[PDB]
């Protein structure tokens, strides 16, 4: 039942992610506190994270963001039909290599040309402010904004994105998988439901499915490059300690 599988994945997405594209669009219109310079960064910190260099404080907020998202993605994955029937070690492998591809795809839903929603929708940090930071911190988000602006031009909705994220997670290509064949069959079913869904939901764009296959490849390269920046920071920055869960994810990634 392909329509059932799609509905179940979409409901799991709506249940487990605090932010989605509809919610983000409602906020990003007709009020989040705007962080556009050092004064407003310090103001936002006193109101939103009341508990060090500005770039390093932002770095810690960004880690806290990602840790929560990894938790949401793990719950989402456990609700993907068939995922919990996989070898537990393969589930770990799929999440390890999949979470950041999923994170950067879903970041697009909270990004526009001027900045991004942060802190559970209560803040908006500008793209120009991020570029203004000292190296290497100013080099982290720009490729993600670039990816997002092209991704958002596909005009996907949450029903599309939920299937796309499920496809990212259920990927038989990952290094170290024990049960490659079973995961491949899982992925084939999810990709088949994604293909059918895009044809139904986007009859105007007959190449949308191969465009999204290419975005999956682009996301893999984006994550590889991001991990290289993680390593630059961990070994050259005095005060930027990695959260242990994110350290586990990046360890022996690429």
């Amino acid at each position: 039942d392909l329509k059932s599988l799609a509905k179940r994945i979409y409901e799991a997405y709506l249940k487990n992610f605090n932010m989605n594209k509809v919610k983000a669009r409602v906020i990003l219109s007709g009020p989040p506190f705007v962080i556009h310079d050092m004064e407003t960064l310090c103001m936002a910190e006193k109101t939103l994270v009341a508990k060090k260099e500005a770039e390093v404080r932002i770095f810690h907020c960004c880690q806290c963001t990602s840790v929560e998202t990894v938790t949401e993605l793990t719950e989402f994955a456990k609700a993907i039909p068939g995922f919990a029937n996989l070898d537990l070690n393969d589930q770990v492998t799929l999440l390890k290599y999949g979470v950041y591809e999923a994170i950067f795809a879903m970041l697009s839903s909270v990004m526009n040309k001027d900045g991004m929603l942060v802190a559970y929708g209560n803040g908006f940090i500008t793209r120009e402010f991020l570029k203004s930071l000292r190296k290497p911190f100013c080099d982290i988000m720009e490729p993600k904004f670039d990816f997002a602006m092209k991704f958002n031009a596909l005009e996907l909705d949450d029903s599309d994105i939920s299937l796309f994220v499920a496809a990212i997670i259920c990927c038989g290509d990952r290094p170290g998988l024990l049960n490659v064949g079973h995961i491949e069959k899982m992925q084939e079913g999810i990709v088949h439901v994604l293909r059918l869904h895009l044809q139904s939901n986007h009859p105007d764009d007959i190449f949308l499915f191969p465009k999204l296959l290419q975005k999956m490849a682009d996301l893999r390269q984006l994550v590889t490059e991001h991990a290289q920046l993680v390593q630059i920071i961990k070994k050259t920055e005095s005060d930027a300690a990695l959260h242990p869960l994110l350290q586990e994810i990046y360890r022996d990634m690429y």
Partner: peptide, 10 residues
Amino acid sequence: PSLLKKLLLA
């Protein structure tokens, strides 16, 4: 067991 494995087992 890893932190990730702990998340999956919860």
